[PDB]
Amino acid sequence: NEDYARPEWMIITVLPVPPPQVRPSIAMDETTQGQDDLTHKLSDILKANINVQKLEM
Amino acid sequence: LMAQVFFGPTYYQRLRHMVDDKIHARARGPVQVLTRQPVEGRSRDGGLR
RNA sequence: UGCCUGGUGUCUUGGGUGU
Numbered sequence: 001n002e003d004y005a006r007p008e009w010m011i012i013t014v015l016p017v018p019p020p021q022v023r024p025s026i027a028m029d030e031t032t033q034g035q036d037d038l039t040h041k042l043s044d045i046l047k048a049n050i051n052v053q054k055l056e057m
Numbered sequence: 058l059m060a061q062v063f064f065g066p067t068y069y070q071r072l073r074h075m076v077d078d079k080i081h082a083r084a085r086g087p088v089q090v091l092t093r094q095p096v097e098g099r100s101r102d103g104g105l106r
Numbered sequence: 107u108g109c110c111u112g113g114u115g116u117c118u119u120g121g122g123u124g125u
Contacts, residue, residue, distance in 0.1 A: 024090050026116050
């Protein structure tokens with residue numbers, strides 16, 4: 001569909017970052033809280049993006 | 058009684074399942090952080106599915 | 107006049123209960 005599903009949109013060029021409501025953090029104990037799995041995966045993705053940008057230039 | 062009754066001693070044993078350890082009710086209470094639905098468990102004042 | 111408190115992990119696993 002030209003308006004809604006264009007074929008080139010199947011390739012990701014910009015990634016949407018969900019709000020913390022989607023990936024809430026949990027307090028494992030009284031002091032240390034735990035980052036969610038999605039948060040760690042997004043951190044890894046962003047590190048890889050930074051690495052690619054640094055290497056390219 | 059018009060009917061005679063079978064009558065005698067028998068060995069009975071009390072099992073761990075008592076009603077006061079199973080009765081549970083909930084009007085409102087804690088909810089999960091991710092889904093904002095009632096938590097699971099009688100010990101946590103949870104809801105029924 | 108000294109004045110009262112609501113806020114509860116998560117993920118696995120195991121053993122059970124009623125059909």
